[model samples]
Target chain A: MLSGLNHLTLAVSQLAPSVAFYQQLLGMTLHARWDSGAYLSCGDLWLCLSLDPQRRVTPPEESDYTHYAFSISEADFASFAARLEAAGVAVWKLNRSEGASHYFLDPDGHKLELHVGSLAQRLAACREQPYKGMVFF
Target chain B: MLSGLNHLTLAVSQLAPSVAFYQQLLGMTLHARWDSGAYLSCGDLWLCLSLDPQRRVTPPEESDYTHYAFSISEADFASFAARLEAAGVAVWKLNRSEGASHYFLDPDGHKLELHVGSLAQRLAACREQPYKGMVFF
Candidate 1:
């Protein structure tokens, strides 16, 4: 079987900064990096960040409604936060109700949230498990 | 440090067929699925498919170029290909030159690829490395 998600592509204003941020903050291994873009391994998922100089950075008001959330172990939250703080990365917010978390944007203004625990635990708490005929967008 | 990508979110037209294809072809386990979306685990990465009724499916135009790729082991390629074939999924191309293989859009038009072996080896052999600073529009 295909297994799980393999990778994601994100647009960034600059490649170097994005690469640096991902490499430093997320400990992503630079599998194949290029001048215009880079391929990084986040465990199993491959995250590709591409530079788009011609594209204007989207303002907050006109920003496209897109965001990405990453799951982390509940135990690793503090250490991750500490790393972000040590590096002077700005963390927007942390939501414990959502199960220990925080929000931050990448260099390209991509909204990202770090959630604690696996999706299974969260879904079980919601009592909304997947059933046959469940429609996914 | 937060090492590696944990998950990605993508909009899909229909959830059922996409889910079926992913489950059957990719062998992705539905770790946490819901009415609006589903989360599938591939190793440590989570592939999230979100259902959107009002969103128009983005065409594969230059203005909105988006795609994802996965790194797989050579041992897993045959099983992955066989599963996709059983599901009647059409593969866009299988580039052995770079040791990179890929599958095309799901029912909703998401491009997915699987690269076997080292990305460095693939890039070196394949003259058409997309991330090699080519800067294609």
Candidate 2:
């Protein structure tokens, strides 16, 4: 019925800086921009940044544990972490799971993650030290 | 700095039903399941349903226009729409953009969209009927 994630649309109170953040830091390519919204892409994922006047901003720490994660190589993880530190991006959570994960917040306080592992690696880790009643299908 | 979206982790109040929703309706394959969370995949998109007791569920229509959209073929759009209708899923918003989009609410009130188009198609449409001060990059 469904193929895969086509896109993710996020509401931003300010558009230009968010666009810059995505383009410069996250390495997404800008496709187009309008008065109210912009379109960008990273690999197969299309990202939409919609400017909303009535948007409610929630701090990442105060929100639920929902987040979007991007994959980075192990070799680049240290440099990326340093880049984030230099940019003064706040780290919301430390990695405790199967891989090298760094959880951080976007300009709008939306939670994002940088992960350096694949599903197979995580599953292998789980096999070694499985979660309670963990079942792999 | 990033390759692509690795995965999206969503905090769901109930784990089992959400898993069923993804597996049965959205056609995501279950990769693994534990007491507190489940891992599913649709194509290259890895989805994580995390059980969160403190999740703040918001009505899709009331929340800011942030959403995750999945792609479906033009042929499957109608049948999938029928499936949503038969399942009693509520429509949160109607399509008003370049592509065929259907917005609806999940059991956890998370906003999800089904779109039947590509980024190239959207960009072409935007070129034809550009938004106010729209600029293509």
Candidate 3:
């Protein structure tokens, strides 16, 4: 038995750089920082970037099996995309058929998606005309 | 740029059991259930337990390198401890010198820790003493 998620922990290759990227990208304030990790808050949810000295830092792999969906305002999409491009990060266009888009990979090769619309809106659009049985993560 | 956390997606072995566990343990109501996953809410945070058919379900290894932490009220500690034990789950007695009490491992090998006491209480208890290095996942 477990309680609701207080925070989601991610293993990062470099702590400081990752912290900077997340803080800049999400506009999240640093709630708690430690020698081994940092806790960031975007509203009530926390994103914890943890450091593991012994773990190998590998490039992105299809089988890595990790991705997080972050919801942003539809209006903020262009600005965010420009920011990523300016920083030389490759942004992927995840065509979810409802005009929602996404990007991929942080400094640690963590896959992340930025959805341009609300969950309910996207679900409604998908149900009206299903697309390849694509399921939300 | 990323917005806040929409939900945390975890690969679960069986959606039904995981759903049932969280519902009863955290007193969370199911927000949405689809064929591939289920969304449950605790306050504004949502946990998405996604079903991955090909993924291997194994006990959490010390080397796996990722975990989550859940915070609860100090008053809830007794009920939480009793509920966990009644469910036949192992509860680890955390050293109060660290300013929190915690437990570990759910049925799906998810490591969980409970920080019942407030931050002030923790700081006061550990005053002048070096903080203990405790890692849980």
Candidate 4:
């Protein structure tokens, strides 16, 4: 019986650049750091980037469609989009009836999302999504 | 500006077993399912398990030391642990000064944690732990 999510971690290729991506680009605080992993927080939630020891994680291949998402305020979407582009982070857009998502990949090839709605809205949008046609993996 | 975590996803070898793990063992609600993926809800947050198209994922190495945690109330820890054991899920103990954790692996070999406190409490516990020896990667 779980109550809620406390944290989600991804395997990053290097701790430094990924840390910078979360800290400087996403504006999360570096909550904790170790040689192999780091904890990041955005007040209510945590996103961890732990070093992948296998060294086999490659960039998110275009064929790969799986990724994680975070919610963002509609008002803040423009600026976040601009900021991501300014930092040279690749950003892509996917739209559904409920809203739009700004999809991008981390330094380690992990696909991530910043969507402009609540979770309820996101689920609603995807219900009728033309799955095969949509570019999202 | 990220408001909060919307979802975390894992590329599982198969979606069916993973869905059963989160829904039956972890008590997550399956919100939706598609040909290649499914969505699970835990109160406000969401977890996604998508079929690995290339079947590229493998068991996390012991040295990886990386896994995500879910917060459970101190009030409900006993029954949760018992249920896990009754279900024949493997469990291990991990300790930090702030709390104790029930560590285990999902059927797909993704490490998962169910801990005794909030993220804030867990992070606080790590502050006092002499780094590099707590089994937390």
Q: What is the C-alpha RMSD of each candidate to the true structure, in Å?
A: 5.7, 1.2, 5.1, 4.9
Chain A TM-score across all models, in listed order: 0.77, 0.93, 0.81, 0.80
Lowest summed lDDT across 10 adjacent residues in model 1 chain B is found at: B57-66
* Candidate 1: tens digits of C-alpha lDDT, residues B1-137: 45445456666777777777676656677755566667776665667777866435444442333456666777888776666677676545455523557555666656667766554454455446454444322
Model with the higher lDDT, candidate 2 or 3: 2
True contacts kept of 1: 0.36
Whole-model lDDT, model 2: 0.87
Q: How many clashes show up in model 3?
A: 0
| lDDT for position A56 in model 4 | 45
Candidate with top lDDT is 2
Deviation (Å) of A121 in candidate 4: 1.8
User: What DockQ do the predictions score, one after another?
Assistant: 0.29, 0.83, 0.29, 0.39
Over 4 Å off in model 1, which ranges? A24-32, A42-45, A52-56, A59-67, A71-97, A128-137, B62-65, B71-98, B118-137
Interface RMSD of 1: 6.1
Listed for every candidate in order, the interface RMSD values in angstroms are: 6.1, 1.1, 6.0, 5.8
Q: Candidate 4, clashing residue pairs?
A: A65-A137, B65-B137
lDDT of all predictions: 0.62, 0.87, 0.62, 0.71
Q: Model 4, B12-119: lDDT tens per residue?
A: 888778889988778888877777777788877778788886654445453244466787888887788777888887543356422666777787666678777665
DockQ of 4: 0.39
Q: Which stretches of candidate 4 lie over 4 Å from their true place?
A: A55-57, A62-64, A91-98, A123-137, B62-66, B90-99, B132-137
Q: Which one is best on TM-score?
A: 2
lDDT of 2 by residue, A1-137 (tens): 78899899989989988998899877789999999999998888889999987666678757788899989999998889889889999899988777788888888888899999887787788888889979999
